[model samples]
Target chain A: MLYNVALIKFKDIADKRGHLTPIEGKIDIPFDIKRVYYITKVDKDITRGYHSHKKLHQVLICLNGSVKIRLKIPDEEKIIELNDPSVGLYIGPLVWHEMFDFTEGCVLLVLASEYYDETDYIRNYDFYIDEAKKRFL
Target chain B: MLYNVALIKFKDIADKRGHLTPIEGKIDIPFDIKRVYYITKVDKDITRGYHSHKKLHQVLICLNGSVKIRLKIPDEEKIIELNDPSVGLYIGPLVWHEMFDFTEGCVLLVLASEYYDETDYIRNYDFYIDEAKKRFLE
Candidate 1:
Protein backbone atom coordinates (compact mmCIF):
# COMPACT_ATOMS: atom_id res chain seq x y z
CA MET A 1 0.00 0.00 0.00
CA LEU A 2 1.13 3.49 -0.85
CA TYR A 3 1.40 5.80 2.13
CA ASN A 4 1.04 9.57 1.99
CA VAL A 5 3.05 11.96 4.10
CA ALA A 6 0.96 14.33 6.16
CA LEU A 7 1.40 16.88 8.91
CA ILE A 8 0.14 15.95 12.34
CA LYS A 9 -0.94 18.97 14.36
CA PHE A 10 -0.41 18.87 18.12
CA LYS A 11 -2.44 20.48 20.86
CA ASP A 12 -0.64 23.63 21.93
CA ILE A 13 -1.75 24.78 25.37
CA ALA A 14 -0.29 28.11 26.49
CA ASP A 15 -0.89 30.39 29.40
CA LYS A 16 0.94 33.00 31.46
CA ARG A 17 3.22 30.20 32.57
CA GLY A 18 4.28 28.65 29.26
CA HIS A 19 3.28 26.43 26.36
CA LEU A 20 2.41 22.74 26.62
CA THR A 21 2.08 20.65 23.48
CA PRO A 22 0.42 17.28 23.97
CA ILE A 23 0.98 14.42 21.53
CA GLU A 24 -1.40 11.69 22.52
CA GLY A 25 -1.67 8.05 21.62
CA LYS A 26 -4.50 7.05 19.24
CA ILE A 27 -5.64 10.69 19.51
CA ASP A 28 -3.09 13.00 17.86
CA ILE A 29 -0.87 10.62 15.95
CA PRO A 30 -1.86 7.38 14.23
CA PHE A 31 0.42 4.90 15.97
CA ASP A 32 1.33 3.62 19.40
CA ILE A 33 4.65 5.23 20.18
CA LYS A 34 7.54 2.96 21.10
CA ARG A 35 10.52 5.34 21.04
CA VAL A 36 11.30 9.04 21.27
CA TYR A 37 14.42 10.84 20.04
CA TYR A 38 15.44 14.40 19.25
CA ILE A 39 18.20 16.15 17.33
CA THR A 40 19.64 19.42 18.50
CA LYS A 41 22.70 21.71 18.45
CA VAL A 42 23.07 21.09 14.74
CA ASP A 43 25.83 22.72 12.75
CA LYS A 44 24.87 24.97 9.87
CA ASP A 45 24.31 23.41 6.42
CA ILE A 46 24.43 19.79 7.53
CA THR A 47 22.13 16.95 6.56
CA ARG A 48 20.91 13.95 8.54
CA GLY A 49 18.80 10.78 8.10
CA TYR A 50 20.02 9.47 4.78
CA HIS A 51 18.20 6.17 5.14
CA SER A 52 14.85 4.42 4.98
CA HIS A 53 13.25 1.84 7.18
CA LYS A 54 11.63 -1.38 6.04
CA LYS A 55 8.90 -1.65 8.65
CA LEU A 56 9.23 1.41 10.85
CA HIS A 57 6.92 4.39 10.90
CA GLN A 58 8.03 7.71 12.32
CA VAL A 59 6.81 11.24 12.89
CA LEU A 60 9.27 14.09 12.77
CA ILE A 61 8.59 17.34 14.61
CA CYS A 62 10.64 20.47 14.76
CA LEU A 63 10.53 21.40 18.40
CA ASN A 64 12.79 24.43 17.88
CA GLY A 65 14.17 26.40 14.92
CA SER A 66 13.48 24.84 11.49
CA VAL A 67 14.37 21.98 9.11
CA LYS A 68 13.86 20.85 5.52
CA ILE A 69 12.85 17.26 4.80
CA ARG A 70 13.25 15.60 1.45
CA LEU A 71 11.00 12.57 0.97
CA LYS A 72 11.13 10.26 -1.98
CA ILE A 73 8.79 7.50 -2.97
CA PRO A 74 9.24 5.37 -6.07
CA ASP A 75 7.77 7.78 -8.61
CA GLU A 76 7.27 11.00 -6.64
CA GLU A 77 9.60 13.49 -5.03
CA LYS A 78 8.46 15.82 -2.24
CA ILE A 79 10.17 18.37 -0.01
CA ILE A 80 8.63 19.74 3.15
CA GLU A 81 9.80 22.49 5.48
CA LEU A 82 9.16 21.88 9.13
CA ASN A 83 9.59 25.00 11.27
CA ASP A 84 6.91 24.77 13.90
CA PRO A 85 6.77 22.63 16.98
CA SER A 86 3.04 22.05 16.75
CA VAL A 87 3.25 20.14 13.48
CA GLY A 88 4.84 16.74 12.72
CA LEU A 89 5.48 14.91 9.49
CA TYR A 90 4.47 11.28 9.29
CA ILE A 91 6.81 9.04 7.36
CA GLY A 92 5.83 5.54 6.32
CA PRO A 93 8.10 2.67 5.45
CA LEU A 94 10.29 2.59 2.31
CA VAL A 95 10.28 6.34 1.96
CA TRP A 96 13.78 7.62 1.30
CA HIS A 97 14.22 10.51 3.75
CA GLU A 98 16.90 13.17 4.11
CA MET A 99 16.63 15.95 6.66
CA PHE A 100 18.75 19.06 6.20
CA ASP A 101 18.85 22.87 6.20
CA PHE A 102 18.50 22.99 9.94
CA THR A 103 18.52 26.47 11.48
CA GLU A 104 20.72 27.18 14.44
CA GLY A 105 19.51 25.77 17.75
CA CYS A 106 17.09 23.56 15.93
CA VAL A 107 15.61 20.66 17.84
CA LEU A 108 14.00 17.91 15.77
CA LEU A 109 11.92 15.43 17.73
CA VAL A 110 11.13 12.02 16.27
CA LEU A 111 8.51 9.57 17.51
CA ALA A 112 9.01 6.05 16.30
CA SER A 113 6.62 3.13 16.10
CA GLU A 114 9.27 0.55 16.79
CA TYR A 115 12.47 0.00 18.72
CA TYR A 116 16.04 0.28 17.47
CA ASP A 117 16.90 -2.67 15.22
CA GLU A 118 19.78 -2.48 12.81
CA THR A 119 18.34 -4.85 10.22
CA ASP A 120 15.22 -2.73 9.62
CA TYR A 121 17.20 0.08 8.02
CA ILE A 122 18.19 0.45 4.38
CA ARG A 123 21.10 2.85 4.52
CA ASN A 124 22.29 2.70 0.95
CA TYR A 125 20.58 5.05 -1.51
CA ASP A 126 21.09 2.85 -4.61
CA PHE A 127 19.86 -0.22 -2.78
CA TYR A 128 16.84 1.78 -1.56
CA ILE A 129 16.03 2.81 -5.14
CA ASP A 130 16.26 -0.72 -6.39
CA GLU A 131 14.22 -2.08 -3.54
CA ALA A 132 11.59 0.59 -4.03
CA LYS A 133 11.31 -0.41 -7.67
CA LYS A 134 10.93 -4.10 -6.84
CA ARG A 135 8.36 -3.56 -4.09
CA PHE A 136 6.25 -0.57 -5.16
CA LEU A 137 6.96 0.05 -8.83
CA MET B 1 3.87 0.26 46.82
CA LEU B 2 6.13 3.14 47.74
CA TYR B 3 7.59 5.08 44.85
CA ASN B 4 10.51 7.45 44.71
CA VAL B 5 11.51 10.27 42.43
CA ALA B 6 14.77 9.94 40.53
CA LEU B 7 16.64 11.18 37.49
CA ILE B 8 16.72 9.26 34.20
CA LYS B 9 19.83 9.88 32.20
CA PHE B 10 19.50 9.89 28.42
CA LYS B 11 22.07 8.61 25.98
CA ASP B 12 23.40 11.63 24.10
CA ILE B 13 24.97 11.00 20.70
CA ALA B 14 26.96 13.97 19.48
CA ASP B 15 28.97 14.52 16.33
CA LYS B 16 30.18 17.33 14.13
CA ARG B 17 26.64 17.86 12.84
CA GLY B 18 24.46 17.90 15.94
CA HIS B 19 23.40 16.06 19.06
CA LEU B 20 20.70 13.42 19.35
CA THR B 21 19.12 12.31 22.61
CA PRO B 22 17.08 9.11 22.56
CA ILE B 23 14.64 8.00 25.22
CA GLU B 24 13.85 4.44 24.35
CA GLY B 25 11.07 2.21 25.54
CA LYS B 26 12.02 -0.56 27.98
CA ILE B 27 15.69 0.39 27.53
CA ASP B 28 16.08 3.94 28.76
CA ILE B 29 12.84 4.17 30.71
CA PRO B 30 11.37 1.70 33.13
CA PHE B 31 8.00 1.33 31.43
CA ASP B 32 6.61 1.12 27.96
CA ILE B 33 6.06 4.67 26.72
CA LYS B 34 2.62 5.44 25.37
CA ARG B 35 2.40 9.22 25.34
CA VAL B 36 4.81 12.10 24.72
CA TYR B 37 4.22 15.76 25.60
CA TYR B 38 6.17 18.91 26.36
CA ILE B 39 5.78 22.34 27.99
CA THR B 40 7.61 25.38 26.71
CA LYS B 41 7.64 29.19 26.50
CA VAL B 42 6.66 29.30 30.14
CA ASP B 43 6.75 32.40 32.31
CA LYS B 44 9.68 32.61 34.67
CA ASP B 45 7.75 32.71 37.91
CA ILE B 46 4.61 30.67 37.38
CA THR B 47 4.12 27.03 38.38
CA ARG B 48 2.50 23.98 36.82
CA GLY B 49 1.33 20.46 37.76
CA TYR B 50 0.38 20.72 41.42
CA HIS B 51 -1.27 17.35 41.52
CA SER B 52 -0.75 13.63 42.06
CA HIS B 53 -1.62 10.71 39.87
CA LYS B 54 -3.22 7.37 40.57
CA LYS B 55 -1.69 5.16 37.87
CA LEU B 56 0.22 7.43 35.55
CA HIS B 57 4.01 7.30 35.57
CA GLN B 58 5.94 10.07 33.90
CA VAL B 59 9.50 11.10 33.19
CA LEU B 60 10.01 14.85 32.95
CA ILE B 61 12.93 16.15 30.91
CA CYS B 62 14.10 19.68 30.43
CA LEU B 63 14.90 19.78 26.75
CA ASN B 64 15.82 23.45 26.79
CA GLY B 65 16.36 26.09 29.44
CA SER B 66 15.83 25.12 33.11
CA VAL B 67 13.12 24.13 35.60
CA LYS B 68 12.71 23.31 39.25
CA ILE B 69 10.61 20.30 40.16
CA ARG B 70 9.48 20.01 43.76
CA LEU B 71 8.69 16.44 44.69
CA LYS B 72 7.08 15.46 47.99
CA ILE B 73 6.51 12.10 49.53
CA PRO B 74 4.86 11.48 52.88
CA ASP B 75 7.60 12.55 55.31
CA GLU B 76 10.15 14.06 52.97
CA GLU B 77 10.48 16.97 50.55
CA LYS B 78 13.02 17.12 47.75
CA ILE B 79 13.63 19.63 45.02
CA ILE B 80 15.38 18.83 41.76
CA GLU B 81 16.78 21.31 39.30
CA LEU B 82 16.47 20.10 35.71
CA ASN B 83 18.72 22.28 33.58
CA ASP B 84 20.17 19.72 31.24
CA PRO B 85 18.30 18.15 28.33
CA SER B 86 19.94 14.80 28.75
CA VAL B 87 18.52 14.14 32.20
CA GLY B 88 14.91 13.38 33.18
CA LEU B 89 13.10 13.09 36.50
CA TYR B 90 11.05 9.95 36.90
CA ILE B 91 7.80 10.69 38.74
CA GLY B 92 5.87 7.77 40.08
CA PRO B 93 2.23 7.51 41.03
CA LEU B 94 0.74 8.71 44.35
CA VAL B 95 3.33 11.46 44.59
CA TRP B 96 2.57 15.15 44.88
CA HIS B 97 4.50 17.00 42.19
CA GLU B 98 4.89 20.69 41.49
CA MET B 99 6.90 22.10 38.63
CA PHE B 100 7.97 25.75 38.69
CA ASP B 101 10.89 28.14 38.67
CA PHE B 102 11.12 27.95 34.93
CA THR B 103 13.69 29.96 33.08
CA GLU B 104 12.84 31.71 29.84
CA GLY B 105 12.28 29.40 26.85
CA CYS B 106 12.16 26.39 29.09
CA VAL B 107 10.96 23.22 27.39
CA LEU B 108 9.81 20.45 29.72
CA LEU B 109 9.27 17.14 27.93
CA VAL B 110 7.13 14.47 29.55
CA LEU B 111 7.03 10.80 28.62
CA ALA B 112 4.04 9.03 30.02
CA SER B 113 3.22 5.38 30.59
CA GLU B 114 -0.50 5.73 30.11
CA TYR B 115 -2.95 7.72 28.06
CA TYR B 116 -4.92 10.75 29.27
CA ASP B 117 -7.53 9.87 31.87
CA GLU B 118 -9.24 12.32 34.17
CA THR B 119 -9.71 9.82 36.96
CA ASP B 120 -5.96 9.25 37.18
CA TYR B 121 -5.26 12.75 38.45
CA ILE B 122 -5.65 14.04 41.98
CA ARG B 123 -5.58 17.75 41.44
CA ASN B 124 -6.60 18.76 44.93
CA TYR B 125 -3.68 19.28 47.26
CA ASP B 126 -5.54 18.43 50.44
CA PHE B 127 -6.79 15.15 49.06
CA TYR B 128 -3.35 14.32 47.73
CA ILE B 129 -1.67 14.94 51.10
CA ASP B 130 -4.29 12.88 52.86
CA GLU B 131 -3.89 10.00 50.44
CA ALA B 132 -0.11 10.24 50.71
CA LYS B 133 -0.24 9.99 54.48
CA LYS B 134 -2.42 6.92 54.30
CA ARG B 135 -0.29 5.21 51.65
CA PHE B 136 3.13 5.90 53.13
CA LEU B 137 2.86 6.88 56.80
CA GLU B 138 0.39 4.20 57.73
Candidate 2:
Protein backbone atom coordinates (compact mmCIF):
# COMPACT_ATOMS: atom_id res chain seq x y z
CA MET A 1 0.00 0.00 0.00
CA LEU A 2 1.08 3.58 -0.49
CA TYR A 3 0.21 4.61 3.03
CA ASN A 4 -0.69 2.93 6.31
CA VAL A 5 -4.20 2.29 5.06
CA ALA A 6 -6.04 0.08 7.51
CA LEU A 7 -9.44 -0.47 9.04
CA ILE A 8 -10.04 0.82 12.56
CA LYS A 9 -12.91 -0.68 14.51
CA PHE A 10 -14.78 1.68 16.76
CA LYS A 11 -16.59 0.92 19.99
CA ASP A 12 -20.25 0.16 19.32
CA ILE A 13 -22.44 0.70 22.35
CA ALA A 14 -25.53 -1.38 21.69
CA ASP A 15 -28.51 -1.75 23.94
CA LYS A 16 -32.30 -2.02 23.87
CA ARG A 17 -32.56 1.49 22.53
CA GLY A 18 -30.20 0.93 19.63
CA HIS A 19 -26.53 1.03 18.73
CA LEU A 20 -24.19 4.00 18.85
CA THR A 21 -20.60 3.95 17.60
CA PRO A 22 -18.40 6.68 19.00
CA ILE A 23 -15.16 7.71 17.32
CA GLU A 24 -12.84 9.97 19.23
CA GLY A 25 -10.00 11.97 17.79
CA LYS A 26 -6.46 10.92 18.77
CA ILE A 27 -8.02 8.00 20.65
CA ASP A 28 -9.65 5.79 18.06
CA ILE A 29 -7.84 7.33 15.11
CA PRO A 30 -4.35 8.76 14.62
CA PHE A 31 -5.17 12.45 14.23
CA ASP A 32 -7.40 15.05 15.78
CA ILE A 33 -10.83 15.53 14.18
CA LYS A 34 -11.06 18.86 12.41
CA ARG A 35 -13.80 18.43 9.80
CA VAL A 36 -16.79 16.18 9.31
CA TYR A 37 -18.81 15.31 6.22
CA TYR A 38 -21.03 12.67 4.68
CA ILE A 39 -21.86 11.54 1.16
CA THR A 40 -25.47 10.55 0.74
CA LYS A 41 -28.10 9.92 -1.94
CA VAL A 42 -25.42 8.61 -4.23
CA ASP A 43 -26.35 6.60 -7.27
CA LYS A 44 -25.08 3.08 -7.57
CA ASP A 45 -23.22 3.76 -10.80
CA ILE A 46 -21.58 6.95 -9.60
CA THR A 47 -18.09 6.83 -8.17
CA ARG A 48 -16.33 9.37 -6.00
CA GLY A 49 -12.96 10.21 -4.45
CA TYR A 50 -10.44 10.26 -7.32
CA HIS A 51 -7.89 12.33 -5.46
CA SER A 52 -5.39 12.24 -2.63
CA HIS A 53 -4.58 14.76 0.05
CA LYS A 54 -1.13 16.06 0.76
CA LYS A 55 -1.53 16.61 4.50
CA LEU A 56 -5.11 15.74 5.44
CA HIS A 57 -5.89 12.49 7.15
CA GLN A 58 -9.34 10.91 7.01
CA VAL A 59 -11.33 8.01 8.37
CA LEU A 60 -14.24 6.98 6.17
CA ILE A 61 -17.13 5.00 7.61
CA CYS A 62 -20.17 3.66 5.80
CA LEU A 63 -22.72 5.00 8.17
CA ASN A 64 -25.77 3.56 6.45
CA GLY A 65 -25.02 1.38 3.45
CA SER A 66 -21.96 -0.06 1.72
CA VAL A 67 -19.25 1.25 -0.60
CA LYS A 68 -15.97 0.04 -2.06
CA ILE A 69 -12.82 2.15 -1.99
CA ARG A 70 -9.72 1.68 -4.12
CA LEU A 71 -6.38 2.74 -2.65
CA LYS A 72 -3.02 2.91 -4.38
CA ILE A 73 0.51 4.13 -3.86
CA PRO A 74 3.16 3.39 -6.52
CA ASP A 75 3.12 -0.32 -7.17
CA GLU A 76 0.77 -1.51 -4.43
CA GLU A 77 -3.01 -1.14 -4.57
CA LYS A 78 -6.09 -2.58 -2.93
CA ILE A 79 -9.86 -2.25 -2.88
CA ILE A 80 -11.62 -2.10 0.49
CA GLU A 81 -15.32 -2.63 0.97
CA LEU A 82 -16.88 -0.59 3.73
CA ASN A 83 -20.27 -1.79 4.93
CA ASP A 84 -20.03 -1.84 8.69
CA PRO A 85 -20.81 1.31 10.58
CA SER A 86 -18.45 0.38 13.38
CA VAL A 87 -15.54 0.03 11.00
CA GLY A 88 -13.59 2.95 9.50
CA LEU A 89 -10.97 3.06 6.75
CA TYR A 90 -8.09 5.34 7.68
CA ILE A 91 -6.50 7.13 4.72
CA GLY A 92 -3.39 9.13 5.36
CA PRO A 93 -1.51 11.58 3.20
CA LEU A 94 -0.21 10.83 -0.33
CA VAL A 95 -2.48 7.85 -0.87
CA TRP A 96 -4.64 7.95 -3.95
CA HIS A 97 -8.13 6.59 -3.34
CA GLU A 98 -11.44 6.22 -5.13
CA MET A 99 -14.88 5.35 -3.75
CA PHE A 100 -17.18 3.34 -5.95
CA ASP A 101 -19.67 0.48 -6.09
CA PHE A 102 -21.89 2.32 -3.68
CA THR A 103 -25.00 0.57 -2.49
CA GLU A 104 -28.28 2.40 -2.54
CA GLY A 105 -28.80 4.92 0.27
CA CYS A 106 -25.19 4.75 1.26
CA VAL A 107 -24.13 7.39 3.72
CA LEU A 108 -20.35 7.55 3.80
CA LEU A 109 -19.19 9.62 6.74
CA VAL A 110 -15.70 11.05 6.78
CA LEU A 111 -13.71 12.34 9.74
CA ALA A 112 -10.97 14.57 8.52
CA SER A 113 -7.86 15.85 10.30
CA GLU A 114 -7.87 19.21 8.57
CA TYR A 115 -10.29 21.71 7.13
CA TYR A 116 -10.92 21.92 3.40
CA ASP A 117 -7.93 22.99 1.35
CA GLU A 118 -8.04 23.04 -2.42
CA THR A 119 -4.30 23.19 -2.90
CA ASP A 120 -3.76 20.10 -0.77
CA TYR A 121 -5.60 17.84 -3.18
CA ILE A 122 -3.83 15.94 -5.97
CA ARG A 123 -6.62 15.43 -8.46
CA ASN A 124 -4.84 14.16 -11.55
CA TYR A 125 -3.71 10.53 -11.58
CA ASP A 126 -0.62 11.15 -13.71
CA PHE A 127 0.53 13.93 -11.42
CA TYR A 128 -0.24 11.69 -8.45
CA ILE A 129 1.84 8.92 -10.01
CA ASP A 130 4.79 11.20 -10.59
CA GLU A 131 4.49 12.62 -7.10
CA ALA A 132 3.96 9.24 -5.47
CA LYS A 133 7.05 7.80 -7.18
CA LYS A 134 9.18 10.62 -5.85
CA ARG A 135 7.59 10.71 -2.39
CA PHE A 136 6.83 7.08 -1.51
CA LEU A 137 8.67 4.74 -3.95
CA MET B 1 -35.66 27.43 23.64
CA LEU B 2 -32.61 27.14 25.83
CA TYR B 3 -29.02 28.07 25.21
CA ASN B 4 -29.52 28.99 21.56
CA VAL B 5 -30.71 25.58 20.53
CA ALA B 6 -31.34 25.78 16.78
CA LEU B 7 -31.07 23.83 13.58
CA ILE B 8 -28.12 24.67 11.38
CA LYS B 9 -28.43 24.17 7.66
CA PHE B 10 -25.45 22.57 6.00
CA LYS B 11 -24.20 23.10 2.49
CA ASP B 12 -25.38 20.30 0.24
CA ILE B 13 -23.51 19.86 -2.99
CA ALA B 14 -25.85 18.02 -5.27
CA ASP B 15 -24.81 16.71 -8.65
CA LYS B 16 -25.30 13.80 -11.01
CA ARG B 17 -23.61 11.41 -8.61
CA GLY B 18 -25.58 12.33 -5.49
CA HIS B 19 -25.56 14.70 -2.57
CA LEU B 20 -22.62 15.47 -0.33
CA THR B 21 -22.80 17.62 2.76
CA PRO B 22 -19.67 19.11 4.24
CA ILE B 23 -19.62 20.31 7.83
CA GLU B 24 -16.59 22.26 8.90
CA GLY B 25 -15.66 22.59 12.55
CA LYS B 26 -15.79 26.13 13.99
CA ILE B 27 -17.19 27.21 10.62
CA ASP B 28 -20.51 25.44 10.25
CA ILE B 29 -20.53 24.52 13.95
CA PRO B 30 -19.63 26.41 17.07
CA PHE B 31 -16.54 24.50 18.16
CA ASP B 32 -13.78 22.33 16.74
CA ILE B 33 -14.53 18.71 16.11
CA LYS B 34 -13.13 16.33 18.73
CA ARG B 35 -15.41 13.27 18.49
CA VAL B 36 -17.98 11.78 16.15
CA TYR B 37 -20.72 9.24 16.85
CA TYR B 38 -23.92 7.92 15.39
CA ILE B 39 -26.93 6.09 16.78
CA THR B 40 -28.55 3.50 14.57
CA LYS B 41 -31.08 0.65 14.75
CA VAL B 42 -33.32 2.68 17.05
CA ASP B 43 -36.95 1.70 17.42
CA LYS B 44 -39.78 4.17 17.31
CA ASP B 45 -40.69 3.74 20.96
CA ILE B 46 -37.14 4.08 22.12
CA THR B 47 -36.21 7.51 23.43
CA ARG B 48 -32.57 8.54 23.70
CA GLY B 49 -30.58 11.51 24.97
CA TYR B 50 -32.31 12.35 28.23
CA HIS B 51 -29.49 14.49 29.46
CA SER B 52 -27.40 17.58 28.86
CA HIS B 53 -23.73 18.41 28.64
CA LYS B 54 -21.79 20.67 30.97
CA LYS B 55 -19.11 21.63 28.48
CA LEU B 56 -19.55 19.57 25.35
CA HIS B 57 -21.03 21.15 22.25
CA GLN B 58 -22.80 18.98 19.73
CA VAL B 59 -24.64 19.07 16.44
CA LEU B 60 -26.98 16.18 15.74
CA ILE B 61 -27.80 15.27 12.16
CA CYS B 62 -30.37 12.78 10.96
CA LEU B 63 -28.41 11.01 8.31
CA ASN B 64 -31.29 8.77 7.38
CA GLY B 65 -34.96 8.48 8.30
CA SER B 66 -36.52 10.81 10.88
CA VAL B 67 -36.47 11.53 14.60
CA LYS B 68 -37.98 14.10 16.94
CA ILE B 69 -36.01 15.68 19.76
CA ARG B 70 -37.25 17.63 22.75
CA LEU B 71 -35.14 20.37 24.26
CA LYS B 72 -35.55 21.95 27.70
CA ILE B 73 -33.80 24.58 29.73
CA PRO B 74 -34.86 25.75 33.16
CA ASP B 75 -38.44 26.71 32.34
CA GLU B 76 -38.60 26.84 28.57
CA GLU B 77 -38.90 23.77 26.41
CA LYS B 78 -39.65 22.81 22.82
CA ILE B 79 -39.83 19.80 20.55
CA ILE B 80 -37.95 19.75 17.29
CA GLU B 81 -38.24 17.08 14.66
CA LEU B 82 -35.13 16.19 12.68
CA ASN B 83 -35.67 14.63 9.30
CA ASP B 84 -33.32 16.46 7.01
CA PRO B 85 -29.82 15.20 6.37
CA SER B 86 -28.57 18.66 5.50
CA VAL B 87 -29.88 20.08 8.76
CA GLY B 88 -28.35 19.68 12.21
CA LEU B 89 -29.66 20.51 15.65
CA TYR B 90 -27.03 22.36 17.61
CA ILE B 91 -27.16 21.48 21.30
CA GLY B 92 -25.06 23.72 23.47
CA PRO B 93 -24.24 23.42 27.14
CA LEU B 94 -26.87 23.28 29.94
CA VAL B 95 -29.68 22.28 27.57
CA TRP B 96 -31.54 19.09 28.33
CA HIS B 97 -32.49 17.00 25.32
CA GLU B 98 -34.47 13.88 24.45
CA MET B 99 -34.66 12.06 21.11
CA PHE B 100 -37.68 9.97 20.29
CA ASP B 101 -40.26 9.05 17.66
CA PHE B 102 -37.62 7.69 15.37
CA THR B 103 -38.41 6.14 12.02
CA GLU B 104 -36.99 2.76 11.31
CA GLY B 105 -33.34 2.73 10.27
CA CYS B 106 -32.82 6.25 11.54
CA VAL B 107 -29.16 7.18 11.77
CA LEU B 108 -28.50 10.05 14.15
CA LEU B 109 -24.99 11.34 13.70
CA VAL B 110 -23.44 13.57 16.33
CA LEU B 111 -20.41 15.81 16.14
CA ALA B 112 -18.97 16.68 19.50
CA SER B 113 -16.53 19.35 20.48
CA GLU B 114 -14.98 17.29 23.26
CA TYR B 115 -13.97 13.74 23.94
CA TYR B 116 -15.85 11.27 26.13
CA ASP B 117 -16.08 12.66 29.65
CA GLU B 118 -18.67 11.17 31.99
CA THR B 119 -18.19 13.93 34.51
CA ASP B 120 -19.43 16.53 32.06
CA TYR B 121 -22.78 14.84 31.58
CA ILE B 122 -25.90 15.76 33.55
CA ARG B 123 -27.96 12.60 33.56
CA ASN B 124 -30.64 13.39 36.06
CA TYR B 125 -33.50 15.62 35.00
CA ASP B 126 -34.15 17.04 38.44
CA PHE B 127 -30.51 17.86 39.04
CA TYR B 128 -30.37 19.32 35.59
CA ILE B 129 -33.34 21.54 36.33
CA ASP B 130 -31.79 22.70 39.58
CA GLU B 131 -28.41 23.36 38.09
CA ALA B 132 -29.91 24.90 35.00
CA LYS B 133 -32.00 27.28 37.03
CA LYS B 134 -29.05 28.41 39.09
CA ARG B 135 -26.73 28.72 36.14
CA PHE B 136 -28.91 30.13 33.36
CA LEU B 137 -31.76 31.76 35.24
CA GLU B 138 -29.84 33.47 37.99
Against the native complex, each candidate's DockQ, computed on alpha carbons, is 0.75, 0.83
Q: Estimate how well candidate 1 is docked, as a DockQ score.
A: 0.75
Task: List, residue by residue over B35-82, the lDDT tens digit for candidate 1.
Answer: 889877777778888889989999998877779988877767788899
Candidate 2 per-residue lDDT, tens place, B6-76, comes to 78999999999888899888898888888888999888789899999889889999988889999998778
What is candidate 2's TM-score against the reference? 0.95
Chain A of candidate 2 compared with the true chain A, TM-score: 0.95
lDDT of each: 0.84, 0.89
User: Tens digits of per-residue lDDT for model 1 on A66-90?
Assistant: 7999998787888899987888899
